[PDB]
Request: fold
Amino acid sequence: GVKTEQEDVLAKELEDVNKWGLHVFRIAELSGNRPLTVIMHTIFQERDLLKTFKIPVDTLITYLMTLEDHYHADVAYHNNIHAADVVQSTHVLLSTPALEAVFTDLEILAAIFASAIHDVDHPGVSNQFLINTNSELALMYNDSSVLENHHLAVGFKLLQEENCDIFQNLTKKQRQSLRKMVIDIVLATDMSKHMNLLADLKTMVETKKVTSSGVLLLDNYSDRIQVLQNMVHCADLSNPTKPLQLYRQWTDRIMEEFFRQGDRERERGMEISPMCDKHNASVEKSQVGFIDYIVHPLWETWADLVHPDAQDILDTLEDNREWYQSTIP
Ligand SMILES: [Mg+2]
Ligand SMILES: [Zn+2]
Reply:
């Protein structure tokens, strides 16, 4: 009843769980492709969420394994490893000094649970592809945040499988509040909402208030949920802020997934989506564009909100940006 030698190496890697730049791909290999299960378990133990919400440990493990099984192993980017990465990145962002004692246990549970379910059952093609092909998913969700609606529906539906209801001991009031927050967070992961989220985060930085203790003041639901939505959005767009050996693995995976969508579009004579044409691609120029127009404006605004807690993350982002610029053919 002590861990095997593979289990010990996994445990030593999981000591980095509170650090930006966790070896998540190594944890995926060591856990037998269970990165989301072991990282969620570690985070739930670390934050004492099993005791606070009276979650039976067997129910937690059964749900986490079920959730992880509904991420597609054949999808190169939007898989259980990406879910695990966004969970661990949200975990680190929640621990930022400028947010110490700001958020309740329920809000923390919401942000982490939202991160874990936020891409579940992703088929490895975009909303636009599902809409243009008249897919069943697009029909059910009236072409509106199709994947993000689906992620939420599956994440909640899986609570009803045998010994999977991790919220069985929460009051109705707790469950209604958790549910609304998880829905507001995951629907905010739709990139179509990015510009509005960023405008609202900028507006909050301009009218920012801190207590005499130096920590962010958020006294209404609108402001608290906006910060959690931008936090998980930041975790979702965190690849270019990681050490370059990690960023480059994520870039290889997203480009594999985009090129596979491009191949499916070309074989069916559909217009090939941006960045999805493997015969007409500038991976390096794309990353510099993504950083310049999307990732840097978001993380620059986040860094202002929690000044100076995010300086080393913003510095890594600017270094990764210069590295991709310097490799443009
Ligand atoms: Mg998504
Ligand atoms: Zn995602």
Notes: Residues 118-119, 147, 189 surround magnesium ion (ligand 1) (CB under 6 Å).
